[PDB]
Amino acid sequence: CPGIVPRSVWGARETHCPRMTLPAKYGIIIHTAGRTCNISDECRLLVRDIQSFYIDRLKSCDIGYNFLVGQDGAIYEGVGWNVQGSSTPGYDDIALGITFMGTFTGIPPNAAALEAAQDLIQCAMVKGYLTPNYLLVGHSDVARTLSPGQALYNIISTWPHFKH
Amino acid sequence: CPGIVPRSVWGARETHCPRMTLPAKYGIIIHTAGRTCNISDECRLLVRDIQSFYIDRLKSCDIGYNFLVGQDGAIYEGVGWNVQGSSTPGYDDIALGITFMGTFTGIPPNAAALEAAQDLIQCAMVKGYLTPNYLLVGHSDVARTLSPGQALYNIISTWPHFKH
Ligand code: NI
Ligand code: NI
Ligand code: NI
Ligand code: NI
Ligand code: NI
Ligand code: NI
Numbered sequence: 001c002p003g004i005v006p007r008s009v010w011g012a013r014e015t016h017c018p019r020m021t022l023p024a025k026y027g028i029i030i031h032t033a034g035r036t037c038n039i040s041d042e043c044r045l046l047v048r049d050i051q052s053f054y055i056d057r058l059k060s061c062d063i064g065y066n067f068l069v070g071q072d073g074a075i076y077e078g079v080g081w082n083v084q085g086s087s088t089p090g091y092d093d094i095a096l097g098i099t100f101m102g103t104f105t106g107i108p109p110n111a112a113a114l115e116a117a118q119d120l121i122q123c124a125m126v127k128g129y130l131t132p133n134y135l136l137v138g139h140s141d142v143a144r145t146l147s148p149g150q151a152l153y154n155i156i157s158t159w160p161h162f163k164h
Numbered sequence: 165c166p167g168i169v170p171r172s173v174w175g176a177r178e179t180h181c182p183r184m185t186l187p188a189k190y191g192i193i194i195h196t197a198g199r200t201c202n203i204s205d206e207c208r209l210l211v212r213d214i215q216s217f218y219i220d221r222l223k224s225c226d227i228g229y230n231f232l233v234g235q236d237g238a239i240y241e242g243v244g245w246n247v248q249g250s251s252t253p254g255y256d257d258i259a260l261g262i263t264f265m266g267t268f269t270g271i272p273p274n275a276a277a278l279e280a281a282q283d284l285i286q287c288a289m290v291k292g293y294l295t296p297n298y299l300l301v302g303h304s305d306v307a308r309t310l311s312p313g314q315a316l317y318n319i320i321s322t323w324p325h326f327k328h
Contacts, residue, residue, distance in 0.1 A: 114322040122286055122324050155322070158275040160283040 001123035002116055004067070004075045010044035012051060017061035018093070020084040023131045026095030027121055028088055029156050030139045031148035036071045036102025036109075043070035046101055047078070060086050065097040067120065073112030075120050081129060088143050096130065105149035114155065121159075136161040165287035166280055168231070168239045174208040176215055176241075181225040184248040187295045190259035190327075191285055192252055193320045194303040195312040200235055200266025207234035210265055211242075224250050229261045231284060237276030239284055245293050255306055260288065269313035282323065299327035 032050060037043035047068055054060040064087040065078035078097070079085055085097035098117055100109045108114070124130040136159055139147035148156075156162060196214065201207035215227035222228075228251040229242035242261075243249055249261040262281055264273045272278065288294040300323050303311040312320070321328055 111322045111326070111328070115324060115326055118282075118322075119324040122289060125286065126290055158278040160279055160286055162275075162279060 001127065002075050002119045004077050004120075005040075005044070006077050007080070010047045010076060012048070012063075013055065015055075015062045017079065017086075018084040019082055020093050022081065022129045023134075024094055024096045024124075024129065025131050025134060026091055027124070027130055027134055027136045027161075028091065028095050028097050028139060028142065029117070029137070029148050029152070030065060030087060030097055030099030031104050031152055032068075032099060032101050033103050033147060034101070038071045040072060040074065043072050043074060043076065043101065046070070047076045050101070054086075062086075065099045067096070067098050069098065069100045069109070069113045069117045069120075071100075071102060071110050071113050073110075073116050075116050088139065091142055096124065100148065100152065103149065104152040105146065106151055108149075108151045108155050118159065134161055135163045137163045165290065166239055166283040168241050168284075169208070171241050171244070174211045174240060176212070176227070177219065179219070179226040181243060182248045183246050184257065184260075186245065186293050187298070188258055188260045188293065189295060189298060190255055190306075191288070191294060191298055191300045191325075192255065192259045192261050192303055192306065193281070193300065193312050193316065194229065194251055194261050194263035195268050195316055196232070196263055196265045197267055197311055197313070198265070202235045204234070204236045204238055207236050207238055207240070207265060210234070211240045218250070226250075229263045231260075231262045232265055233262065233273070233277050233280050233284070234265045235274050235277050237274075237280055239280050245288070245291075252303065252306055259306075260293065261303075264312070264316065267313060268316040269310065270315050272315040272319045278319065285323070298325055300325045301327045
């Protein structure tokens with residue numbers, strides 16, 4: 001199971017949103033469709049920016065993703081394990097939203113990032129956070145959106161438990 | 165744990181070989197460096213030749229791989245979780261050799277074959293056949309040889325615990 005830089009480290013704003021009880025029956029991969037980051041400091045600011053965006057512009061209760069993966073190869077805690085994401089209408093409370101920071105329509109995240117996400121996925125299943133036969137899906141498979149990019153979609157569609 | 169077709173199904177010849185100590189330290193990705201089989205009637209047969217090739221020609225105790233994955237999206241039991249392989253001189257006593265059947269230098273195995281390989285690793289992880297901090301490597305990293313081949317290599321480098 002990978003290391004996860006907590007909200008207390010990247011400077012997350014304190015909230016209190018809908019809690020989520022595990023295990024999750026879904027693992028949904030997302031991309032921010034925004035800029036990427038490839039170093040700690042940079043990535044921490046990017047998650048902070050994304051959160052503020054969710055609170056301020058969209059008026060969401062918090063960042064809409066359970067976890068984020070910077071191209072530094074680090075996993076950043078979004079709302080985390082126990083709190084509900086808000087990116088996939090209908091699925092949020094039964095899925096773990098894992099999103100890569102950046103725009104991967106024409107190019108996939110570097111290997112470091114990909115490794116960390118899967119390491120995170122495998123972990124979650126092993127520890128029962130994801131169900132034994134969890135379903136893996138891209139944002140675009142359940143929600144109408146370009147997320148997480150054809151390039152990235154090409155990769156996760158070869159991953160384990162990828163919903164057909 | 166994905167379905168694994170047992171030795172009895174593809175017709176392995178009986179043998180009693182040196183068992184391996186689990187969990188293993190490495191997960192080694194290999195390619196038969198031979199012909200690619202896309203349908204089961206072809207793949208099953210292929211696995212049989214490999215075994216005879218190993219027993220008959222190489223005078224080895226049994227087929228040299230722990231598992232074999234075909235493009236038919238089938239995982240086949242070589243010597244299994246409990247018996248030492250004989251594909252990596254120097255590591256056969258601490259690694260689990262998993263080989264895709266075929267050549268993959270310019271192009272990697274199809275999603276079906278790829279997915280299976282990882283679901284198998286995840287299985288080993290869940291069942292404890294691999295250590296919590298196991299290493300995933302390409303045969304070429306532990307043996308002077310193209311095996312497994314660039315395209316395939318470029319892919320496993322994005323898998324959990326890839327010991328790049
Ligand atoms: Ni791990
Ligand atoms: Ni599948
Ligand atoms: Ni599985
Ligand atoms: Ni080999
Ligand atoms: Ni040794
Ligand atoms: Ni790594």
